[PDB]
Symmetry: C2
Subunit: 358 residues, 2 copies
């Protein structure tokens, strides 16, 4: 008698013990009120959401939702062990375009990136990965840089984080520490598996709905070609059966690669940083962050105004400050292009002040 | 107090009620032994398995496993969207190659193919669809024919089926009726969501592991261009696990089986008289007679491999010394042709004496 009850109790004990070590709570059920609060919070403009869709690859971008891949058609994995064949032998192992203000987050199963002979176990506070990842902006593209770990490069240790369940929304929250160039980062977790949106019918009960990626196609192409740019981590979610757990490796954009800015462009234009009050001549994370922040201070100044255009970049907008006399050029796609101080006593500066043509 | 307990009880009531209408049982938990029993049944040679991976597209083939796609990267969704538009106006609306004996099963969400503004409701015993699909063999390809329904082609009604839980394995079973040309068809259902195989570690509990598709890339390409329809709808739990989703499932035409295709049987039916078939009309019934007669030849104990057909490199010829018939099988296993040897003719005498057909 009760063989089924015994098996269920045994499953429940094993699940509770695994979840405890992994920092995992089973998804809740959602009242109407909860689901509304959860949907409000995930639809904020700067929200980054992880879905607990098991065994999935995800790419999230602020303002445009989450792209999900699951199944064998998630052979995207193999660019992630081709790389892992390649560390046998240059710290940048591989750059992968994902497609053509703005933050981004890429995540996939951590176990497929684990070290030689390694099984990642719940309870660990860090995991040594032979390859770490970083999202960057490379010439219009969102790209993933795969970096060989070791010593002379970037450490192998990746921190394991635990999410906090918000009892008001039924969502989870992971928080990343502040770094040079960026405040603490909140990442939302939708604990309900959601490979796509359920149709809003009587066949489903209320759940939060993660905004789904729309717009440009996500497609991985290998592109021809420091540790402060790394905000990557591992967290645990329930497995597909829902009774065990799986580790997920998560990678965020470099603080300096944000759509409006890229480290590449800041470096290219650092020659102008003296016009924004920066004396440093060395180019490093610290001074490029100074330059990025100086451009943001110029654009945020209440007396900075849109004034004219930069002929060479069709549809660019120029933002002028009448006190510092600085201009900053923004391309039509929103990318920072360049900036410098206007000389009002020179021909070209006089033409700009008079006509707006920079 | 107990606000969470009340919400959970209400969720459980709603789930049981929806599951009841849909014929759905929640997945079980598995002892080690149940998992081994389930894995043994799914590895039987002719097994066709559906996975209850929610909101997924799947392609299953005997002996090669299940291919799964879920997420946005289910873009072939729009294949079925495009035809649902093309239906405003030819019965055949599209033919989709899936890539280059052997049976096959293709499944996706049934709401994708319902009418616009149509919601499929649990409890229905059939569903009227504006398209139905058929799996075929077209020129080495496994392909999907999407057919407009209506008076002018094929009916719209698709049966809704319920799966039976096997308490010994923890798997479900769906059965399709026998038809002209095929016996009853057993379809296994792995009720545990499984977009891919869990790595066998201490982080997972025992569950049935469905064999996964290896081999040829599964890619969808449009191709230039009835008792062949064994399609149905069944329900599985949704991604949250607390509601249900309808799945539309299509099997291969009984005459399209890798070894045979309706197209090749039609092409070679001129030889059916050598296999004892007097009918001159070509239809499902007589093409099935021909298919069955070729199978009777290949199954005959006296039939032996003998020589080759050089015109098709690597082919094998199967000869029966009582009927004097030959059947030619291509190296990929496709039936090519067959006919009766005339031993008093030059080429028949050459074949008997040298194996050169």
């Amino acid at each position: 008698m009760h063989e089924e009850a015994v098996a269920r109790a045994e499953a429940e004990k094993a699940k509770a013990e695994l979840f405890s070590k992994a920092g995992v709570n089973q998804p809740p059920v959602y009242t109407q009120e909860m689901m509304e609060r959860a949907n409000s919070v995930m639809n904020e403009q700067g929200a980054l959401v992880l879905n607990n869709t098991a065994s999935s690859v995800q790419l999230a971008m602020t303002g445009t939702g989450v792209w999900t891949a699951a199944g064998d058609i998630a052979g995207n994995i193999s660019k992630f062990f081709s790389n892992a064949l390649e560390k046998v032998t240059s710290p940048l192992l591989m750059r992968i375009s994902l497609g053509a203000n703005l933050e981004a987050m890429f995540s996939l199963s951590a176990q497929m990136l684990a070290g030689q002979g390694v099984v990642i176990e719940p309870g660990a506070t860090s995991v040594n990965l032979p390859v770490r990842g970083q999202l960057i902006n490379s010439n219009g593209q969102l790209a993933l840089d795969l970096l060989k770990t070791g010593n002379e490069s970037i450490p192998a240790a990746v921190p394991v984080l635990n999410a906090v369940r918000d009892t008001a929304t039924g969502l989870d929250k992971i928080t990343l520490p502040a770094v040079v160039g960026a405040p603490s980062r909140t990442i939302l977790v939708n604990p309900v598996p959601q490979p796509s949106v359920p149709t809003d019918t009587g066949n489903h009960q209320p759940v939060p709905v993660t905004p789904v990626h729309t717009g440009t196609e996500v497609k991985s192409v290998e592109m021809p070609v420091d540790v402060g740019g790394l905000r990557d981590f591992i967290y645990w979610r329930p497995d597909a059966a829902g009774t065990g757990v799986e580790a997920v490796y998560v990678m965020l954009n470099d603080p300096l690669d944000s759509g409006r800015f890229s480290r590449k462009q800041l470096d290219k234009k650092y020659k102008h940083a003296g016009d924004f009050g920066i004396s440093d001549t060395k180019k490093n994370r610290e001074t490029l962050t100074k330059f990025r922040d100086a451009i943001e201070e110029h654009l945020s100044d209440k007396d900075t105004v849109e004034k004219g255009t930069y002929r060479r970049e069709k549809g660019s907008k120029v933002y002028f400050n009448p006190n510092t006399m600085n201009v900053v050029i923004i391309k039509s796609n929103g990318e920072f292009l360049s900036g410098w101080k206007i000389n009002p006593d020179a021909d070209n500066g006089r033409i700009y002040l008079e006509t707006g043509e920079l």
